[model samples]
Target chain A: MKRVLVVDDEESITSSLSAILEEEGYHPDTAKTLREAEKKIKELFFPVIVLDVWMPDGDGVNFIDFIKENSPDSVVIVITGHGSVDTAVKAIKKGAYEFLEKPFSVERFLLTIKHAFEEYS
Target chain B: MKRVLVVDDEESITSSLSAILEEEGYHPDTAKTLREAEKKIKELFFPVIVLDVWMPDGDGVNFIDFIKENSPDSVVIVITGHGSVDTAVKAIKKGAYEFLEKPFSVERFLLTIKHAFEEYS
Candidate 1:
């Protein structure tokens, strides 16, 4: 079974995303901080990761490097409310699969996840 | 654009499979012998190859080793009228992606190609 990791500091973000992913038949795990996310990833393979740029503990952009090093097959979808073309480029250069601006439509979010599974598999 | 190489001694096999692959948006090339296939692959990169087991000049099984040595990313789908479980294992151990016995359905063939593209990408 494919697993997804939702990493964000906000409760409203991780909780909602977790529900949506579970409804779609994917096993999803959530982390309120970057440290928590890192721990979970070290424990198991999260083939798909929905990551926010501005976290309480660390920059998601830098963490992208960590994921790439440890799990090259992990497909990252960057979702940040505060983002720019430069930030998107930075994430992609570090090997993020896709960058989605925050407040995206659910349809687009699910579609992106679908594409991630396709790409990762 | 993705290119597909169809290596078979039979004109009917190459011609029909070429049409199917082209309809699915792949640039299809044909080689009637193992030597011809090797020459074509050396000239251009075929990301995917449909190879028949017995050729006029050489065994497709041995040629698979050559393809893997030179083009590690090229996905090879082995097609054989003289197929067995043991032969299938031999091809797979040598890095062939999928082995399809002769008289395979059109749907399965297309699906296998689709999966190969997904896996290769």
Candidate 2:
């Protein structure tokens, strides 16, 4: 099974991303914090990760570095409800495959993941 | 850029599939007959193919062999408006990645392609 990791402090966002991933026939796991996401990253290999930028525990930008160092081929898509220009570029520089703002359509989300899979791994 | 080939006698189906593939950030090319599909295949390497089983010019089943020989890594997903058990088994034997019946929902179609990319190429 193809594995996907969804990291967001917001429960609703994680749930929504998880459901979409499942519908696409992926085995999705959700983490509500950077700590939980880190733990899961060590346990399982995720080809794709949807990460929220502003987490209560830690910024998602830094976590992208962790994923690149450890997972290497794991593609990260950074998402934020805040949608700041600085955060978007920072995430990209930190090695995010795509940057998405919150309240995005399902089509946009799915398309981003699809393109990442096609181009990245 | 990843390329996808959509082969169908029905213009509407090919157009729709083409649009969806483009939305997902892929270069999608359509062929109305097996001959055209063959020509396109010779010109470009397609990693994924959505093929209609019943084409007026030739059988889509036979074209599977062409793809397997020319582009071994290419994955073919067979579809039919008039689906049959015999054709499904034949397609599987000929190394079709998946079999889809006509009037399939957009979700199912997208999911099938997604899973194929995840598992095959």
Candidate 3:
């Protein structure tokens, strides 16, 4: 099964995303904070990571380097509630697969996940 | 040399993009229409292609398949004056590397081009 990790401080976002991921046949894992995400990354390599830009413990963009170092093969799709071109550029420059604005349509989200796997392959 | 093709019907858009690309040490080719883009693609393989969504001849999104078929390794960054999640999803599903709204910041555009080359690598 394709494994995906959804890291966000908001449970509502993670829960909805996890549901969609599961519906699409992807094994979904959720982490409410970057610390938890780091722990999970150390334990298992997720092929795809959906990261939030703002987290309770730390900014998700700042955590991208940690994910890259630990799971070099993982494709990161960064999501943010408040979108900015600067932030998008920062994320992409740091090796993010894509930067998506929050509340993105289910179609768009699914397409991004599909493209992320395509990146992996 | 790193070559990039900017395909747009508007001279203003292509001219500014070409200038930026040239300043960044990339050889930029401008195409005023998809027809011209098609001819250019047949002549040489560009590592990256910046495509406009609406063209005088046809929709740029419709032409993505042609680019993919002709230059399989070329990374396409789709840009549109009118941004829609549906269009972005369509572009990504059809093999676009990324989608950007028109009037995107120079920084974001450059970062995307840089990331596109990385994608090629």
Candidate 4:
């Protein structure tokens, strides 16, 4: 079974991402904050994470760092609400699987995550 | 740069498929016979192969079975000259990533090759 973690501060974003994952027959979990995500990782290892970069408690980069330290095999797909080209470069440099600008289509979102799992792990 | 072997007895099919992959910035090599294709694979390592099911010399499925014994990581995209759904499923059960019917678009050809490199070893 493929498990995915979708984390975002905005409840609506987490809801929508989770909906798409569930529709694809994946076990999807949502976290509105980094603390909740850390707790989930404690319970089980998630191979892939669909993450929002601008969480209220911290940024997606923090979660990425945690995974690097704790779960090195985990693949993270970073979604940014607002970003610059520099930020985009930095996101990938920090080991993000891929970065998507907000308001991205669900088709591309699903396709990108599919590519991530297929390519990285 | 990744290498791809496009094997087909038809000159036109090889031309179009190679053209599409060239546009996608891949080094595309074509062989008109199973003997020529076997020689090419010996000369170099191509991580992905695009094989026509109905080769003149012998069988493409035979080559796929050989890949199963050696070069297990090589991704094979089987192209069937004529087939039903049963053949498609069998090709996959033989370890093909996907099966393509004849006269597929150049765009789809490029997309499939891109996907093979991105998804497979």
Candidate 5:
């Protein structure tokens, strides 16, 4: 099965996201912080990672930089509540697979995850 | 559901590719040559096209020209039994999603197709 790492600050959000992924047949792992997310990635590489742009620790793009340097094979998806087209484009150009604005719909979320699976398959 | 259009002169290749895409949960349409490939594209828009550079009657790079014109949203994966890095890089610069040299492994084929689905989504 394909794996997805869903990182968000809120436990509630991560729970819903993980459950949604489970329904879509992904081996989903949840992390509330970038550190936790990085640890999970280090343990085993997941081709696709879903990260929140704003965390108390730092920006998600920083994590993406690590993704670029070390895990050149990985694709990162940035999800932010405070949306910006410029950030999204920058992330994609930086080797991220995509940038998704938050308040994400269930349908679109599934579609995005499904597409991610296809992209890195 | 996503769809894949496979175009090649060899019936055997198309049959195998169609089955493989189907196994991976894609709606695959196969065409035997340039003429048939054109007919398929005119019939329905597939999100991805797996194309062979040498067809009996036409060149696949010419198909990329049409793609640039009509289906700007679609991704095309070029396949060539005879390969060249220069041609592959040129094709990508021209907007083909990727170029796969023949004698490619199944793992690589699945990875390329999956990634194409991710690119446009």
Candidate 6:
């Protein structure tokens, strides 16, 4: 099974997003903070990572480098409540695969993941 | 040389964008209409295409299918004057690699194209 990592500070987001990923036939891993996500990244290779922009521990935008350094092949899709184009561009520049504004539909979310996997494959 | 297609109705946009692509060491092709673009797409395998959403010939959103059918490996980046999340999502769903709002800075535009090529590569 293709493994995916979901990193978000919100319990609800991680649970719901992981469920969705599971339904799509992917093995989903959850992390509540950038620290935890870093640990997980070091331990395994996740082809896809769904990351939140803001976390209790640190800004996810800054954490992209750590993901890239550890899991160079992992595609990072960033989700943000503060949906500024600037922030989205910044994340893209930092090697994110795509940026999705929060409150996104499940269909949109899944399509992005599908695209990421296809491109990276 | 890496070939890129820039599809837009506006002469100024095509000229300016092609120039930027040229500066970045890419061979850029321009088309004023979807019909012309389709012909070019048929003739060559452009690794990347920068497409405008609204064109004098047709909506670029609908043209993505044609590109996918003929040039399956080409990455299409949709650009639009009307920047809506719904439209962006729709374009992404239709197989566009990324969506950029018009009036975007050159830096942002190039970054999108670079990321598209990197992912596809």
Among the numbered candidates, top TM-score falls to 3
Candidate that beats the other on TM-score, 5 or 6, i.e. the better one: 6
Q: State fnat for each of the candidate structures.
A: 0.00, 0.00, 0.00, 0.00, 0.00, 0.00
Instruction: Give per-residue CA lDDT, model 6, range B91-114, as digits (tens).
Output: 775767777777877798788778
Residue pairs whose backbone atoms clash in candidate 1: none
TM-score of each model, paired residue for residue? 0.50, 0.48, 0.66, 0.49, 0.50, 0.60
Candidate 4 ranges beyond 4 A from true positions: A1-121
Q: Candidate 5 chain A: minimum summed lDDT over ten consecutive residues — where?
A: A84-93
- Lowest summed lDDT across 10 adjacent residues in model 6 chain A is found at A84-93
Off by over 4 Å in 2: B1-121
Clashes of 6: 0
How far in Å is the alpha carbon of B97 misplaced in model 3?
6.2
The candidate 3 chain B region of ten consecutive residues with least summed lDDT is B84-93
Which wins on lDDT, candidate 1 or candidate 2? 1
User: Model 3 off-target regions past 4 Å?
Assistant: A1-4, A15-29, A45-48, A72-76, A85-100, A104-121, B1-4, B15-29, B45-49, B72-76, B85-100, B104-121
DockQ of each: 0.02, 0.01, 0.12, 0.02, 0.02, 0.11
Candidate achieving the largest DockQ: 3
Cα error, residue B50 of model 6, in Å, equals 7.8
- CAPRI quality of model 1: incorrect
Q: Model 4, range B5-117, lDDT digits (tens) per residue?
A: 88888887788777877777787778878777776676778788888788888767667887776678888887776854435544664657767777788766777777787
Which digits, one per residue and each the tens of the lDDT, describe model 5 over residues A38-92?
7768888687878888787888877788778778877777778786533554455
> Which of 2 and 5 is ahead in TM-score?
5
Residues A1-120 of candidate 6 have per-residue lDDT tens digits of 467888877888778878888998988777887787777677766788888887888888888888778777778887788886556655775767777887877898788888889978
Clashing pairs in 5: A118-B114, A119-B114, A119-B115, A121-B111
TM-score (C-alpha, index-matched) for candidate 1: 0.50
Point out where model 6 deviates above 4 Å.
B1-51, B58-78, B85-100, B103-121
Clashes of 1: 0
